[PDB]
């Protein structure tokens, strides 16, 4: 198999285009057939400040970041971003994150964002 | 249209102490999930309903093994809604072999590949 590197993901916070009462969200991280998830946090600018480690042994494909609106009976996708593994930075240094725009006639477009750090060590 | 999904049970290849699994159902940007059940032949017998306005898409089914820090996917299938029949109640279900990963067409799932030895028993019908 491949030699193991640790993928360290810092789920910092998000910024949603909408009202406080409309978002109670969690973040799911999916990579290499596994997933880990934050707690749900209420608001337009939720803060999680949670770090995750994944043991990675191949550099193909990506890290999928999903932001979900929690519900009682079903959860609803807020949006998602995909981050190819190969160009995640190789460093032991925690970063502040980068702002990533989530992928979802006369209405204004809606753009939701997540602040996310990732680095290999 | 009202899609009804009966998540019946599964049969895994492996020792029973290795599994504490749940089923996630995704359709039209929503998701619902069963409870976790232990063993190599877990029974959930849980029925779900989804309001559909895109009959051209599919239902993604994922089986996950619950862990403390991370969860591991046991496998997945994608059922095109065009294959689901009309009925007024749940049938005994069909066995589907779980595949290891989705095929992505332009960032959207369009199928699955690489069969496992694991299977799930599912009923789906429209009402």
Numbering used by the authors:
A (entry chain A): -2 to 101, 112 to 128
B (entry chain C): 2 to 128
Any passages from the paper?
The Munc13–1/α-RIM interaction is particularly interesting in this regard since its physiological importance has been demonstrated and both Munc13–1 and α-RIMs are involved in priming and plasticity. Our results suggest that a Munc13–1 homodimer–Munc13–1/α-RIM heterodimer switch regulates neurotransmitter release and some forms of presynaptic plasticity, and reveal the structural basis for homo- and heterodimerization. 2A domain can in fact establish two different types of interactions that lead to either homodimerization with itself or heterodimerization with the RIM2α ZF domain. Since the Munc13–1/α-RIM interaction competes with Munc13–1 homodimerization, this model predicts that Munc13–1 may exist in solution as a homodimer that needs to be disrupted in order to bind to α-RIMs at the active zone.
2A-domain homodimer at 1.44 Å resolution, designed a mutation that disrupts homodimerization, and solved the X-ray crystal structure at 1.78 Å resolution of a Munc13–1 fragment bearing this mutation bound to the RIM2α ZF domain. 2A domain of Munc13–1 encompasses approximately residues 3–130. 2A domain is sufficient and primarily responsible for homodimerization. 2A-domain crystals contains four monomers (referred to as monomers A–D). In contrast, homodimerization involves one side of the β-sandwich. This side contains the concave β-sheet, which interacts with the concave β-sheet of the other monomer in an antiparallel fashion. The interaction involves strand–strand hydrogen bonds through the “naked” edges of the β-sheets, leading to the formation of a β-barrel–like structure. The physiological role of Munc13–1 homodimerization is currently unclear, but it is plausible that it may play an inhibitory role by hindering α-RIM binding or it may help to stabilize Munc13–1 in the cytoplasm, before engaging in interactions at the active zone.
